[PDB]
Amino acid sequence: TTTLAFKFQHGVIVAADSRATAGPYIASQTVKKVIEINPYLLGTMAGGAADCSFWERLLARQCRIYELRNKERISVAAASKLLANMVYQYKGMGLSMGTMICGWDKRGPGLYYVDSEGNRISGTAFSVGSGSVYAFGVMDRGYSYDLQVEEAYDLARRAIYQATYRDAYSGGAVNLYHVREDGWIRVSSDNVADLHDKYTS
Amino acid sequence: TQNPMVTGTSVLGVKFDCGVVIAADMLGSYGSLARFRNISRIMRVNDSTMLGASGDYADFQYLKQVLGQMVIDEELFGDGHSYSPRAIHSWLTRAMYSRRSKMNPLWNTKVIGGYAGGESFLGYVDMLGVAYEAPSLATGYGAYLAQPLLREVLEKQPVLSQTEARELVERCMRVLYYRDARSYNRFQVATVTEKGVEIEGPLSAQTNWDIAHMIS
Amino acid sequence: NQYDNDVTVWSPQGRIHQIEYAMEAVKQGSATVGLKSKTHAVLVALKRAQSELAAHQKKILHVDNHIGISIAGLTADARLLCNFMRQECLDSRFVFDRPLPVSRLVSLIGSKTQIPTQRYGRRPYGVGLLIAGYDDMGPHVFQTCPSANYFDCRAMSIGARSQSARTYLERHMSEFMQCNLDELVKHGLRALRETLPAEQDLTTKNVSIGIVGKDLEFTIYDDDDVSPFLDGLEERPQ
Amino acid sequence: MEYLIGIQGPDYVLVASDRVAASNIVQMKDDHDKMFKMSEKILLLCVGEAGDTVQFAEYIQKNVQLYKMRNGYELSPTAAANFTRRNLADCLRSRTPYHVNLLLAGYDEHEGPALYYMDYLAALAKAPFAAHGYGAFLTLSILDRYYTPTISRERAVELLRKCLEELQKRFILNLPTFSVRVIDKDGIHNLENITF
Amino acid sequence: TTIMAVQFDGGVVLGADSRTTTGSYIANRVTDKLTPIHDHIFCCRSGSAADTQAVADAVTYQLGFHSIELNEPPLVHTAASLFKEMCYRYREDLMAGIIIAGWDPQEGGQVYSVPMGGMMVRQSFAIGGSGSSYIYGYVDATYREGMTKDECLQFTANALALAMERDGSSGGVIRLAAIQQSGVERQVLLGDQIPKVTISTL
Amino acid sequence: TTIAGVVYKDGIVLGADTRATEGMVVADKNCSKIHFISPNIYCCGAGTAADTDMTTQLISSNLELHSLTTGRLPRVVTANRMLKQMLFRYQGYIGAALVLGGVDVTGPHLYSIYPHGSTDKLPYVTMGSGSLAAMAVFEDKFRPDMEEEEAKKLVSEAIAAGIFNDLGSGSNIDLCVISKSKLDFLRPYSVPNKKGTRFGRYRCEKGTTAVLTEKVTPL
Amino acid sequence: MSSIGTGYDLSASTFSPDGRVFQVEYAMKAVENSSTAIGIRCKDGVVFGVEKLVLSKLYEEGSNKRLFNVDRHVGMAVAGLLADARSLADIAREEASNFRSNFGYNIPLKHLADRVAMYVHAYTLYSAVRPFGCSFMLGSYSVNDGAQLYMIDPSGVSYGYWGCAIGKARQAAKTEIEKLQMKEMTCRDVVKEVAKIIYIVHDEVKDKAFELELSWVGELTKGRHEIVPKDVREEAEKYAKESLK
Amino acid sequence: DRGVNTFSPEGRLFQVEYAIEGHKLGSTAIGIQTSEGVCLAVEKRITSPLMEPSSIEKIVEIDAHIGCAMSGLIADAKTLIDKARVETQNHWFTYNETMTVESVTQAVSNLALQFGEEDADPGAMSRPFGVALLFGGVDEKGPQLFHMDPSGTFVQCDARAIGSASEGAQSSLQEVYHKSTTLKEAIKSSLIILKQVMEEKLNATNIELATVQPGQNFHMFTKEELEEVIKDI
Amino acid sequence: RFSPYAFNGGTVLAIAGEDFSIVASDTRLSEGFSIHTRDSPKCYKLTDKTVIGCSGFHGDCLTLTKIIEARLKMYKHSNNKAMTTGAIAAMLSTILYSRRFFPYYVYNIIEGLDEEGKGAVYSFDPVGSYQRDSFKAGGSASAMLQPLLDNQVGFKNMQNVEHVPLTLDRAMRLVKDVFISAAERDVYTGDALRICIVTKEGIREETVPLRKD
């Protein structure tokens, strides 16, 4: 429903799509940066906006879940990452807010996708996004998106979406960091520039 | 920048340091809004035997810092086994009290000029009422930073390490000028000198008002 | 006896044996020597370990950018006290921003150590500390007891069989004062070796040095530059 | 505050409750597959309604509380007792710094009268009743039930009441809401009912 | 409010005080006595609003009372004026209370202090205070000189208060004058049938 | 709102008050006593806002009780002043209570008026509620500033009667509370200035305008 | 009695049928063990004379010192265990520092002495902690309160003295004070006297060896507690030595 | 009676001397630092086949690339390990990278001796723990094995053994284990030494091995891997 | 950005360019608290090792509080972690301050420019709200894009070949520094006196004062 960390579900994977951006949307403070951070190999997330705030809540989420997963020898789910983030952030509220992370893992009841925002919204949908400009994007994408898309098939879907998105979008100094998450692993498909993909596609 | 509303204000205090001494003129007179409650007030404090400090801005606020500095010094001197008040110690400590209050949305405003002589170094330092420390060449305080300081800086630019005497004429000159440009001034002003003897600040001495000029 | 059931138990003489008995614990610890000149404060220490097939973990601890300590006694307790001192030294650096006085820091340890010795149903801390610190009044090397009293020495040795080492300290007492950094460390090694038997002469591996002074901040040499001080051998001077 | 859309029609053949899946932040819908009726226990429901975020928040705490009584008593907790305990818990949270008005919707099995629905206002008021609406919508639906009331109403007749509402909701209401989850509850399990 | 004043005497102090504190039209205290003690060493004359002065007045009384009995010989006045400072440092953006402290301690010898509502404490010869009791600037300056004679000081205080009550509105009714020596406070009450009336302002 | 005065006379202390206790300018109740009797020794008049005054008297009464019993001294009005000043500060200067504390010590009878300020206020003779100055102003006028007890008691009653006449808020009976330090004579009817007209004629109705379908007693 | 596991020396809440408290008494025997600290009131100041115990051969000045500055113008000489003395220095210095801050005048010795004594006395009452094993003197000059000398023991008493001794030799040392007129007498002459008393009282079994430390707080220092000059110490040392012969 | 807090004329505390003995009571654990990685081996020593051998653990993770074998009272150690888990991830929030073997070990050791039996806070120990921990992992710096004692003396090791065989095993390690012995050979050295304290022969249900090797995270050896080292001892 | 209210302003503008092992950090040589500049001398820059050089600017009250703290965090890090201060010191400090300043809005941009204790050069940029990133261009102050661009155009060489056809050397960066400072005075009117550029290497600290042109 908004950008900055966004995910949509498939059976085979989830798509992880994110921006590299510095500051507010009015200027960058750097050009080289990747804001993409790997908190656990369960999935990737990274935002922007109120910078301290996103990093703080995810770092708590990362601490709790990772200790529990690693020691217990029981894999934590989509539901668990989401519950930790939710419980923490409402408490901390009044100390700036703007967390926009997308939680993925495969569970006993099948693949589960929950969208975590800083209001305290916790949502499953066709595609969800939290941050800013993807709000427009969910409209075109839904049409070109099946319930279950293959990984390869999904990579081609991202390339077209983006290539039109750069033409519409007027935010510069970004990269589209593309990751497919095959469950409790995370691999990086490509980290292609938004300026490159308009020519290709 | 913000500053609290000031009632009793200390304003224009110059300080320029010469070898193993500093000369200062600070007003001895603190107006409270309008009425000059104390024409006899002392903005000069004794941290220890070879330190002095002189402060401007809200006079009230200056007294809060004096006590904290005072209680810390009282415990630390007298024993002098290796611990006592030292030139670096007074500057930083006083800066932190000011920082502590900077964290709150109301800060206690005084802008201070430390001249000290510690364990081996003669120091002339500037402390702010929100914090910050540095060694300084010449600094003004309160109203002196906006109004006279640049003409004082200009005299200093050929010779930055001149004598007490040359400083003494400038400072004596500066009160006739104080009256002319700013209002909440008196011409009974205090001459403070920090030396190796101690911190001396005799009573208010005066010279001409000189606002009787009209020649164009 | 029953002059040492708790650290509140007085003897008719008017002495708590547990605080005294806590000093006997310092003798179980490893030999450390503290020496000062007029520009450096030097700490010479014995490191021991259970694996000598592995590098020996330092017995010199970090307190400030010009303060280092050498412990003799209880290892956990010395580290335990160290943290109170470390917190204060680093805090002193924020607030006061002088290079903190050895005499000032040491008295604050005296207030905390007094707490359990004053308190019933507790043990004193049986660790003796030699602190090297350099402030702007020059070096000081101070000894702090298992009690709470301090000595400002020019040279001190507390630890195992420390008497043997003092015989050296008594003999070159005049010399310490004039020295530069190099000279302080060679004397402390010659002292250090004496504690131990006649036929054991130190290696660099089990020697850690914490050097403090006017020309330097805080550097710990574990074998780094230990080899030249050790050179010029002298073996157990009686 | 009331500007959701709930209706619950109590009978003792069934109790039909429906809600929209339409938790919307920004301009699009974060939930539109998540169910808006939460499972406290396998025969008990709480439906939390208010702000989008505050809804998810109310349920998780409550879920722990229902189950806990089940454990403590060693039987299913009393319906009357739970409903009152859910009212004390929503008033306690009201005191706390974040002010939370929450419309709760209690479905319980009671010793009488049969299948029962106990009704909760945004005055944080527990009330026994038959014929209820939650949300801004409560006001029209309670009134339609009032013209034609039955509290032992069969399932066919429940569909007729529903359909006169659904066409009205589509053109006269600000909730055209083609995305709805509708469920009819017998005393043993949750059955899914037709959606218009 | 009240005209309060204290002028420094021979080695001790001469006081003046009014008897009304007014909040505009409504009298906060119809009767105000600022001659009473607050220990036997120190006395103060309290000005500003009624509530701001009263709260300060009871704490300096408590601290001072404990200090003379605990020490065994009485405390000095310089302590009393610092106790008032502490309070004002908290209340320097909300309330204000302009206290002017005078008496004499035996132990270190005579003191005249002004502790302000911003918090300061400084030694003066004579200070007169209140908001509308600042209108005697000429009067205080001409009257006070360095070591003024006791007979002159007595007349000048009564005379200054009179100029106040007539000219400022806030002032009014019985002037309470107090002359203090080393261990004793002696008060005289000057009629409000007596007042010297202002001469031709029209 | 309320019209309360208490006086220092040549006898002891006479408190005068109108009955009515009002929540604002409208009567919550037209019965009871505005001037309240506490322990035997302490009487307190109440004025200004009702909500703030009744509760202040009540809370101080516990404190004063503890102090009286332990100390075994009779209550002092200066003492009473300090307790109200400290309590009201604790609350943070919320609400309006002009309070009239009056108690007899072993010396003279002593009367004080404490407004809500949290002042250390010494009167001479005072009246409270309404506007503090406005009520106080009367005392200077009718009292020559000391006259015999009986003459003074008719005088307060007469001055308080005038405030009742001028300000219709006060209504019903005027009570005089003659207070010593063990004798509390509560004279309901010192003067009745006004009273209502009889509610003799009904506005009752038979059931045919509203009816009843139940009469049962649950168990 | 002294060997026991319940009460007596474990407690101090205990009373004997005589009324005694043994623990508080054991604390008193502890102050006795080390050498004497004397402090003499003049009508113009206090002069101390302290034996400063030489416990090694690698001494520097101020090592194991017993002279503390409680306040700017208060000096404190301790006798008995130095462990307990360091904690007592922190508590006394702290009560004084806050006093100066608030009152803004020189701490009256009568007040300071009452507060430290209360603290010692709170421990003697308690069986929960032991009481300090030292006895101390506080001595001072001011013109706001005069020259004052006070003494606080392990029990928790504060009374003023005009010349006091704490430590082993105190019964002998005190006698020498009755000989001297010291109530009226310059602080310059009294330094000569404290030095000669100490040299004669010392013997090689109260403690091995000492370093003479005298201190000023009087008309000479102008109301400052400072250590005496190198000159002053040596002439007073000399007079001690000449009287010793 | 006399207290336990007291120092003895030997010059050591009573409670602490008892705690070392507590280390000696339990099962033996070997932690060997090789420069190819750090292996931790522990004996299961099961007496019943109804037990499920996976869930007998005595190797627990401080970190995701540091493993720890613990000895003496199994229960007493577990608390120290619980506090350790919170610190390692906490370290990730602040530094923004994972905790070292050295940092974690010094922080737990401060807690090890704090003991005041009477008149000490209930949020602090009345008695010390009788556990010796062996923290073995490879971290940013490289393979490190640190040893922690119940006396709160921490030291760096390359080969350390603790448990009933603690003195015997430790001597025997110094002999075979050197830094001219590879990682797989370290696993063979530990297995031989293990047998005297064990009641039976070595098996793949009677050892549990886990190795943390460079460039890899902590791996718990599977039944096949345990069995390959069993074949050649 | 924000117009000084929360904390005192003290102006100043920071430019940062990273090469490969040489990094220039420049800020103006002034201490301000008031509209006038007190003294040219400053202690905005503080070095902790030759390995790391930190610059805190703007408000002077902020500048002293955090910089000393950074010296404390360094000390702690060498002891416990056993990695000498550098990159590791830098990531840690930016989180704790940026929480501290951002509810009551941040008026200092601290920039840690160093080498890691394992090696590889990092130049780190906070907005004022916690982020750390490695950069080869950086602009920081209210004018957080005014320098950024020159480093983007000249260093990166994206649609540019006339500053270098590749990427700048050490000799080239120092030449460019003097030029950039002369330029800044023209655009930004919040400076007085002198501009100080410190060049941070793993092997040489350099300092140069340069007059305001």
From Swiss-Prot, chain D:
Keyword Cytoplasm listed: yes
GO biological process, one term: proteasome-mediated ubiquitin-dependent protein catabolic process
Cellular compartment(s): Cytoplasm; Nucleus
Modified residues (N-acetylmethionine): M1
GO cellular component, one term: cytoplasm
Keywords on record: Acetylation, Cytoplasm, Nucleus, Proteasome
CDD domains attached to this UniProt entry: proteasome_beta_type_2 (cd03758)
InterPro entries the UniProt entry points to: Ntn_hydrolases_N (IPR029055), Proteasome_beta2 (IPR035206), Proteasome_bsu_CS (IPR016050), Proteasome_sua/b (IPR001353), Proteasome_suB-type (IPR023333)
Induction: Down-regulated by theophylline (THP) and 1,3-dinitrobenzene (DNB), two reprotoxic agents thought to induce infertility.
Keyword Zinc: no
Quaternary structure annotation from Swiss-Prot or TrEMBL: The 26S proteasome consists of a 20S proteasome core and two 19S regulatory subunits. The 20S proteasome core is a barrel-shaped complex made of 28 subunits that are arranged in four stacked rings. The two outer rings are each formed by seven alpha subunits, and the two inner rings are formed by seven beta subunits. The proteolytic activity is exerted by three beta-subunits PSMB5, PSMB6 and PSMB7.
Function: Non-catalytic component of the 20S core proteasome complex involved in the proteolytic degradation of most intracellular proteins. This complex plays numerous essential roles within the cell by associating with different regulatory particles. Associated with two 19S regulatory particles, forms the 26S proteasome and thus participates in the ATP-dependent degradation of ubiquitinated proteins.
Swiss-Prot record, chain F:
Location in the cell: Cytoplasm; Nucleus
Active site: T1 (nucleophile)
Location, primary (coarse class): cytoplasm
This protein's record includes keyword Nucleus: yes
GO molecular function per UniProt: endopeptidase activity; threonine-type endopeptidase activity
EC number(s) on file: 3.4.25.1
Assigned keywords, A-Z: Cytoplasm, Hydrolase, Nucleus, Protease, Proteasome, Threonine protease, Zymogen
Any single Gene Ontology cellular-component annotation: nucleus
GO biological process: proteasome-mediated ubiquitin-dependent protein catabolic process
EC class (word): hydrolase
Catalytic activity, as annotated: Cleavage of peptide bonds with very broad specificity
Transmembrane segments: none
Family listed: Belongs to the peptidase T1B family.
Subunit-level organization: The 26S proteasome consists of a 20S proteasome core and two 19S regulatory subunits. The 20S proteasome core is a barrel-shaped complex made of 28 subunits that are arranged in four stacked rings. The two outer rings are each formed by seven alpha subunits, and the two inner rings are formed by seven beta subunits. The proteolytic activity is exerted by three beta-subunits PSMB5, PSMB6 and PSMB7.
Described purpose of this protein according to its UniProt entry: Component of the 20S core proteasome complex involved in the proteolytic degradation of most intracellular proteins. This complex plays numerous essential roles within the cell by associating with different regulatory particles. Associated with two 19S regulatory particles, forms the 26S proteasome and thus participates in the ATP-dependent degradation of ubiquitinated proteins.
UniProt-recorded name of the protein: Proteasome subunit beta type-7
Gene: Psmb7
Curated annotation (Swiss-Prot), chain G:
Positions where N6-acetyllysine occurs in the chain: K57, K206, K230
Coiled-coil parts of chain: none
GO cellular component: cytoplasm; nucleus; proteasome complex; proteasome core complex; proteasome core complex, alpha-subunit complex
Modified residues (N-acetylserine): S2
Gene3D superfamilies listed in its UniProt record: Glutamine Phosphoribosylpyrophosphate, subunit 1, domain 1
PROSITE patterns, sorted: PROTEASOME_ALPHA_1, PROTEASOME_ALPHA_2
GO molecular function: ubiquitin protein ligase binding
Compartments, record wording: Cytoplasm; Nucleus
GO BP terms: proteasome-mediated ubiquitin-dependent protein catabolic process
Keywords: Acetylation, Cytoplasm, Nucleus, Phosphoprotein, Proteasome
Pfam families, A to Z: Proteasome, Proteasome_A_N
Residues that span the membrane, as ranges: none
SMART domains named among the record's database cross-references: Proteasome_A_N (SM00948)
Modified residues (Phosphoserine): S243
Tissue specificity note: Ubiquitous.
Function: Component of the 20S core proteasome complex involved in the proteolytic degradation of most intracellular proteins. This complex plays numerous essential roles within the cell by associating with different regulatory particles. Associated with two 19S regulatory particles, forms the 26S proteasome and thus participates in the ATP-dependent degradation of ubiquitinated proteins.
UniProt family annotation: Belongs to the peptidase T1A family.
Protein name: Proteasome subunit alpha type-3
Organism, as annotated: Rattus norvegicus (Rat)
UniProtKB/Swiss-Prot annotation, chain I:
Source organism: Rattus norvegicus
InterPro entries recorded: Ntn_hydrolases_N (IPR029055), Proteasome_bsu_CS (IPR016050), Proteasome_sua/b (IPR001353), Proteasome_suB-type (IPR023333)
Keyword field: Acetylation, Cytoplasm, Glycoprotein, Nucleus, Phosphoprotein, Proteasome
Modified residues (Phosphoserine): S34, S40, S134
Functional description taken from the UniProt entry: Non-catalytic component of the 20S core proteasome complex involved in the proteolytic degradation of most intracellular proteins. This complex plays numerous essential roles within the cell by associating with different regulatory particles. Associated with two 19S regulatory particles, forms the 26S proteasome and thus participates in the ATP-dependent degradation of ubiquitinated proteins.
Main location (coarse class): cytoplasm
Cellular localization per UniProt: Cytoplasm; Nucleus
Gene3D superfamilies from the UniProt entry: Glutamine Phosphoribosylpyrophosphate, subunit 1, domain 1
Protein name: Proteasome subunit beta type-1
Sites of N6-acetyllysine modification: K176
One of the GO BP terms on file: proteolysis involved in protein catabolic process
Quaternary structure and interacting proteins, as annotated: The 26S proteasome consists of a 20S proteasome core and two 19S regulatory subunits. The 20S proteasome core is a barrel-shaped complex made of 28 subunits that are arranged in four stacked rings. The two outer rings are each formed by seven alpha subunits, and the two inner rings are formed by seven beta subunits. The proteolytic activity is exerted by three beta-subunits PSMB5, PSMB6 and PSMB7. Interacts with SERPINB2. Interacts with RFPL4A.
Tissues expressing the protein: Ubiquitous.
